[PDB]
Write a structure and sequence with these properties.
Elements lengths: L1 H5 L3 H19 L6 H20 L9 H12 L1 H21 L2 H6 L7 E2 H11 L4 H10 L7 E2 L1 H5 L4 H20 L4 H9 L3
Antiparallel strand pairs: 1-2
Helix pairs in contact: 2-3, 2-5, 3-10, 7-8, 10-11
PDB class: transport protein
Keywords: Ion Channel, Calcium Channel, transport protein
Entry title: Pig Ryanodine Receptor 1 R615C Mutant: Atorvastatin Bound Open Conformation
């Protein structure tokens, strides 16, 4: 069955899915009203990745199936990079918000922070680019008073992103250990250090 599937059209299908996912979450993350949809999308992604792992059972070093998988990933490098950035941004934001330095800028007794203060703190930390900070501001659910609840903002995307990211990391580690001496997989690993 593995040999039959490896020579079919399946690879093409996977590529198409990787195009949609990378574009969908970025669109869905900007509005809270669609949150219940976004979770479902993430639950789909895991179900794909597991199947990919099922294709690597009993795989020897430098097997042909792993090389085909690496070629398929190289073909959709752009969407893969977008997904990795999507995970890394929130993983870093969760730790940055809880930093003591960031707690200096919040001064309202209710604990909310202004958008200008948020941008000032983000620029002061100097870890994100301008467009990234603008994307965080767009995803922020600021009210009519430009007031941002950082405590709710940080914890919005924890559990589902965790569940998908663990499998993504497992897949990357397996591919790295079973196909050494490939620079493209090395670049993909470098993009996913966090």
């Amino acid at each position: 069955n593995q040999q039959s599937l490896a020579h079919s059209r399946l690879w093409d299908a996977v590529v198409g899915f990787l195009h949609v996912f990378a574009h969908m979450m970025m669109k869905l993350a900007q509005d809270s009203s669609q949150i219940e949809l976004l979770k479902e999308l993430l639950d789909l992604q895991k179900d794909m990745v597991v199947m990919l792992l099922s294709l690597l059972e009993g795989n020897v070093v430098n097997g042909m199936i792993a090389r085909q998988m690496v070629d398929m990933l190289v073909e959709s490098s752009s969407n893969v990079e977008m997904i990795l950035k999507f995970f890394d941004m929130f993983l870093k934001l969760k730790d940055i918000v809880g930093s003591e330095a960031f707690q200096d800028y919040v001064t309202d007794p209710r604990g909310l922070i202004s958008k200008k203060d948020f941008q000032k703190a983000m620029d002061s930390q100097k870890q994100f680019t301008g467009p990234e900070i603008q994307f965080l501001l767009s995803c922020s659910e600021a009210d009519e008073n430009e007031m941002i609840d950082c405590e709710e903002f940080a914890n919005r995307f924890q559990e589902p992103a965790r569940d998908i990211g663990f499998n993504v990391a497992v897949l990357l580690t397996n591919l790295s250990e079973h196909v050494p001496h490939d620079p493209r997989l090395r670049n993909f690993l470098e993009l996913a250090e966090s």
